[PDB]
Design an enzyme around this catalytic site. Structure first.
Site, short mmCIF file in Angstrom:
data_model
loop_
_atom_site.label_atom_id
_atom_site.label_comp_id
_atom_site.label_asym_id
_atom_site.label_seq_id
_atom_site.Cartn_x
_atom_site.Cartn_y
_atom_site.Cartn_z
CG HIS A 31 6.83 -9.45 1.90
ND1 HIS A 31 6.92 -9.93 3.19
CD2 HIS A 31 8.10 -9.27 1.48
CE1 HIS A 31 8.19 -10.03 3.54
NE2 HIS A 31 8.93 -9.63 2.51
CE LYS A 65 5.21 -2.90 -3.66
NZ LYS A 65 4.31 -2.48 -2.57
CB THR A 66 0.57 -0.62 -8.57
OG1 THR A 66 1.02 -1.84 -7.97
CG2 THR A 66 -0.02 -0.93 -9.96
CG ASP A 87 -2.24 -0.82 0.77
OD1 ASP A 87 -2.72 -0.75 -0.39
OD2 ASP A 87 -2.68 -1.58 1.66
N1 LIG Z 1 -3.05 10.29 -1.85
C1 LIG Z 1 -2.25 9.39 -2.36
N2 LIG Z 1 -2.67 8.13 -2.47
C2 LIG Z 1 -1.74 7.37 -3.10
C3 LIG Z 1 -0.52 7.74 -3.60
N3 LIG Z 1 0.13 6.66 -4.19
C4 LIG Z 1 -0.70 5.69 -4.04
N4 LIG Z 1 -1.85 6.04 -3.38
C5 LIG Z 1 -2.95 5.21 -2.98
O1 LIG Z 1 -2.55 4.28 -1.96
C6 LIG Z 1 -3.17 3.02 -2.21
C7 LIG Z 1 -2.17 1.94 -2.55
O2 LIG Z 1 -1.47 2.19 -3.73
P1 LIG Z 1 -0.81 1.07 -4.46
O3 LIG Z 1 -0.09 1.60 -5.64
O4 LIG Z 1 -1.78 -0.01 -4.69
O5 LIG Z 1 0.44 0.63 -3.47
P2 LIG Z 1 1.31 -0.77 -3.52
O6 LIG Z 1 0.57 -1.58 -2.55
O7 LIG Z 1 2.62 -0.34 -3.05
O8 LIG Z 1 1.29 -1.30 -4.93
C8 LIG Z 1 -4.10 3.26 -3.35
O9 LIG Z 1 -5.30 3.68 -2.68
C9 LIG Z 1 -3.35 4.36 -4.14
O10 LIG Z 1 -4.13 5.19 -5.02
C10 LIG Z 1 -0.09 9.10 -3.45
O11 LIG Z 1 0.95 9.64 -3.85
N5 LIG Z 1 -1.05 9.86 -2.80
MG LIG Z 2 0.99 -3.24 -6.31
#
Ligand SMILES: Nc1nc2c(ncn2[C@@H]2O[C@H](COP(=O)(O)OP(=O)(O)O)[C@@H](O)[C@H]2O)c(=O)[nH]1
Ligand SMILES: [Mg+2]
Ligand SMILES: Nc1nc2c(ncn2[C@@H]2O[C@H](COP(=O)(O)OP(=O)(O)O)[C@@H](O)[C@H]2O)c(=O)[nH]1
Ligand SMILES: [Mg+2]
EC number: 3.6.5.3
Lengths: 385, 385
Positions: free
Chosen positions: A76, A16-17, A13
């Site tokens: 992970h 990363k995506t 979360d």
């Molecule tokens: N406000 C905000 N939300 C973000 C940002 N980057 C990611 N998110 C949100 O955080 C959540 C997880 O993002 P995600 O890319 O799925 O993270 P991952 O788990 O690392 O792949 C989603 O609700 C994204 O839209 C950011 O820069 N700002």
């Molecule tokens: Mg992801």
């Protein structure tokens, strides 16, 4: 244009995506290419590498001077397997840390694994800065990250940290998109040109051996790295006492070649060696570039009962087969202090001592087998002896 | 980091200076650096470029991969002097064209001088697009620019044209700053890193000849470019019939070397040729890389009284001494139709015919002299005979 392999690592979360999507989108509208949507990348397909299934999304994007192959995984677990098995290797990694939460357990572990498996460069991306206005706060999170990198031997002090919002960049906010261009700038500068396999020293895992009257012994196999040229000195390393001879020909299905290049399946003629002198598991190497060893420290992933692994734990005393390139080698396991048992599905650091010396170096991958069944996969974290 | 030299060129009030400033600002803001104020760039200081005085502003900036040395001149006459004298070197140029007016007299003039002088690459910055809001207009101007470039042998079809606003970029508008990042991108990609002097074919202008007792004939001079090595063959080009001989030594004040390279003042031992066979004006060169000529089309800039040149104009029938590397060779001038006088401080095109053939090629620079004093400076635009 050079080809560099990178990928996003970091706690779940932390973005990363969204970042991976934002990168392809911004570089496309700026330098040209094709943008990938978050959903497409989020919905990672599964690939079976070394009997293990891993979800991995692969995207590609270009900067004016380079081409990037980028990986992003849902969880992970996919990162542990992918990193240990060497499924998707990275010349550099982009550590994504959420400014709102700071470093978390998976962040520390990906940095940990990064070092073990040999990811040479890590660039940090302080994500979610749109949620944090507090400059002093942002600075704290930056200090934590820099020290975490230093704990695991990465130069935290010189580490390029870029502040941004992957969500807003993707959203189309021109101000935030510039932060992506800044990150891409660091990819181009901080991460140096990676070495092409052909530039690496010659290494050919011996697959089979034959003998031809007058012409001598032919050892076949796929050239892993480098190039072997007719008439040069080559060493037979591993298994026994390191031998040396000279290449006197390179064949490819009757076709005689002047040299054998990486990726090619050839047969090399060795002058001054008999079939009987060639054991299974030995590799031909450029003189003085690789050395046989028996003791080594590693990172291993033990398959789950579900992946086709053991249904029972193993203890200090487990003596499995360690499959290196072309053969199994039995060895003894030294588990970490405080370790008790290793459950199926676990990933730990274990010190292995092989019965027979194998030509190895940091990063060499292997499988842990029980009979014919793959029970684990590992990578040589560092050669001990 | 590689170091490339570029500069802005184009018609007045088109935006060369505003662009030069936005570049230093946006690049400093994005990839680190220091912004330079418009005024300081605009009010270019005088530099005494070999007797000649030109107003040139020099700024520097970095992309993630390269470092650029950028020139921006206040007036058309400064671009003409700079290009003819080569005081300012340009590995590439950013042709700035205002979308509000399209190509103007100096656009074409600069492109032509770019050709004549040997400016290899030209990137186009379609400036002032914040003004023009109709796409159709933008496409029409782009075509015209491309056509024009093609006219002077430039790849009109393959030249990257960036549409932007130097003004909005300078003010800090993110949306328009992106277009400068785009422009920086093309500099990084479309412009090749220049050739090192030691990589070009050997050429050594003969300054003197002696005959060492028992060894042979030696010709002294500074290696202009390339490398000479013992055992290599060289041609003596210029004046008479081209001769060929072999270097049997590269001396340097008693120390005997096995090579002479771009930049050194050496002594090249030749096998075969006698002292009496060498003439002033001849160059030692790699066989078949340079031929002797007598007629050429050139671009000349007549110095002014204050620059130490002529205090009186000359008319048709002027027979000046053209200084090519080491000597003066008389030639007869042929001014353009209508031009029946040439004032000092004036630049003019003139076809020349020399009394004796001199080894030359396009882009070769020479001087016009009167009793050892330089009264003109020019460049061979097109070799005719
Ligand atoms: N406000 C905000 N939300 C973000 C940002 N980057 C990611 N998110 C949100 O955080 C959540 C997880 O993002 P995600 O890319 O799925 O993270 P991952 O788990 O690392 O792949 C989603 O609700 C994204 O839209 C950011 O820069 N700002
Ligand atoms: Mg992801
Ligand atoms: N509207 C607008 N004016 C611009 C832009 N770039 C330059 N100018 C203006 O055009 C004028 C000439 O700019 P300058 O850079 O001095 O032109 P130069 O003769 O090519 O050096 C100045 O008033 C600039 O402010 C642009 O993007 N938009
Ligand atoms: Mg100006």
């Amino acid at each position: 244009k050079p080809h560099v392999n990178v990928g996003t690592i970091g706690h779940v979360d932390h973005g990363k995506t969204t970042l991976t999507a934002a990168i392809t989108t911004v570089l496309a509208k700026t330098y040209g290419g094709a943008a990938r949507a978050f959903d497409q990348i989020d919905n990672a397909p599964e690939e079976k590498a070394r009997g293990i299934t891993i979800n991995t999304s692969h995207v590609e994007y270009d900067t004016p001077t380079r081409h990037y192959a980028h990986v992003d995984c849902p969880g992970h677990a996919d990162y542990v397997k992918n990193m240990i098995t060497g499924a998707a290797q990275m010349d550099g990694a982009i550590l994504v840390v959420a400014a709102t939460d700071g470093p978390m357990p998976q962040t520390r572990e990906h940095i940990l694994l990064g070092r073990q498996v040999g990811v040479p460069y890590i660039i940090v991306f302080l994500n979610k800065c749109d949620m944090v206005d507090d400059e002093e706060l942002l600075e704290l999170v930056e200090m934590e990250v820099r020290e975490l990198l230093s704990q695991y031997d990465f130069p935290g002090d010189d580490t390029p940290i870029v502040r941004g919002s992957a969500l807003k960049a993707l959203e189309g906010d021109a101000e935030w998109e510039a932060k992506i261009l800044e990150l891409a700038g660091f990819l181009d500068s901080y991460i140096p040109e990676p070495e092409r396999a052909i530039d690496k020293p010659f290494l050919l895992p011996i697959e089979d051996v034959f003998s031809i009257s007058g012409r001598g012994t032919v050892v076949t196999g796929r050239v892993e790295r480098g190039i072997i040229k007719v008439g040069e000195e080559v060493e037979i390393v591993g298994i026994k006492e390191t031998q040396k001879s000279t290449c006197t020909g390179v064949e490819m299905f009757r076709k005689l070649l002047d040299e054998g290049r990486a990726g090619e399946n050839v047969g090399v003629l060795l002058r001054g060696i008999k079939r009987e002198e060639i054991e299974r598991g030995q590799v031909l190497a450029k003189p003085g570039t690789i050395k046989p060893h028996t003791k080594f420290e590693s990172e291993v992933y033990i398959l789950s009962k579900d992946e086709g692994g053991r249904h029972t734990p193993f203890f200090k005393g487990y003596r499995p087969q360690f499959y290196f390139r072309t053969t199994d080698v039995t060895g003894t396991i030294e588990l970490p202090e405080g370790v008790e048992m290793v459950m199926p599905g676990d990933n730990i650091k274990m010190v292995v001592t092989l019965i027979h010396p194998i030509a190895m170096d940091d990063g060499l991958r292997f499988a842990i087998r029980e009979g014919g069944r793959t029970v684990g996969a590992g990578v040589v974290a560092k050669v001990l002896s």
